[PDB]
């Protein structure tokens, strides 16, 4: 009886913690080996939930980058283009076409092709001395000559076709552009599309929040089991002393 009495309180404390722990989980534990196998299942759920979390994170990053490209001032390769626009006596072409309607936007975007985001500069010889200094610029910079305020349609050997445009860029060179949807120019409704993108990104943020919460829950559950075994196994799953003392 003295031995059982000395042993009892430790076993009782251990049992309370064990009951709380297993009830906190869906599965009921019965032995040391059982607890270990539950550890392993917990690890597997960690490493699955984390993969979904990371993939959704990748999508969210892509969405923010896409939204950000359409932001300012007239959405373009804004990193250097604004400074490059003022360092010459020119104006950004996409900014000149800020006001165009949605109906002509796809046509113009097909027409100008890669040069949509070039700069208008009426001489193009004043840049020739400056040019050697351009070490910080997009890998392909486009320059056009004309009046920035009342720029005339750049002389293109253009030719309209069904839902596409043909152009002779140079002697022995032609480009053929198909009408895109939701273009660059006409940056009035392109705010409409970035509004759609904001609506899209809201859902990704919500879903990512839930997934991160789940991962944290799993991690803390593993922490709880580790703390438990650190403080608990010495008397875990042993026979009940109340019964034997009563006997």
């Amino acid at each position: 009886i003295q031995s059982l009495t000395a042993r009892a309180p430790v076993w009782l404390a251990a049992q309370d913690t064990l009951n709380q722990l297993c009830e906190q989980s869906g599965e009921t534990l019965a032995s040391s080996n059982d607890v270990t196998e539950y550890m392993q299942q917990l690890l597997e759920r960690e490493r699955e939930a984390t993969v979904e979390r990371d993939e959704v994170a990748a999508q969210k990053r892509e969405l923010e980058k896409q939204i950000e490209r359409l932001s300012q001032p007239s959405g373009a390769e804004d990193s250097r283009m604004i400074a490059l626009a003022e360092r010459f006596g020119g104006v950004l072409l996409s900014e000149i076409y800020d006001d165009i309607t949605i109906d002509d936007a796809p046509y113009f975007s097909a027409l100008y092709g890669p040069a949509r985001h070039g700069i208008v500069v009426p001489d193009l010889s004043l840049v020739r001395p400056h040019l050697e200094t351009l070490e910080d610029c997009p890998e392909d910079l486009y320059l056009i000559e004309g009046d920035p305020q009342s720029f005339d349609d750049s002389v293109f050997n253009a030719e309209e076709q069904t839902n596409a445009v043909l152009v002779k860029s140079s002697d022995r060179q032609w480009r053929y552009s198909r009408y895109p949807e939701l273009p660059l120019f006409g940056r009035a409704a392109r705010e409409n599309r970035l509004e759609a993108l904001n609506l899209e990104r809201d859902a990704l943020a919500e879903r990512y929040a839930t997934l991160s919460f789940d991962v944290q829950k799993i991690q803390r559950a593993h922490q709880a089991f580790s703390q438990f075994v650190g403080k608990h196994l010495s008397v875990a799953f042993d026979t009940d002393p109340e019964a034997e003392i009563r006997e």
């Binding site: 309180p9 001032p73 804004d78 604004i82 929040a209 991160s212 803390r220």
Partner: protein
Amino acid sequence: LAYMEGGALRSMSDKALGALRLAVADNEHLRDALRLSEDPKRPERKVQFFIAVYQHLRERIRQDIIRTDDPVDAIEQMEIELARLTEELTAREQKLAI
């Protein structure tokens, strides 16, 4: 606690009451209940005080972000929120503008 002598039990009860007096200083409902609880000849008063505490906490849960009604279970959700928020705080550093 069943395997302890009454002296230790009273010591714990007294020190807990000492803490409670400070914790509950501002509130009035809980303060009245605690006051009523300390006559040894009316035990049910203490459990009534406990019920008052639990109800008072349940009103303050702010279920916009939490759903458990039992506060004791709500502690884990506050812990999870702290971990997640500290993780979100990390960094982005894509800083470049006009």
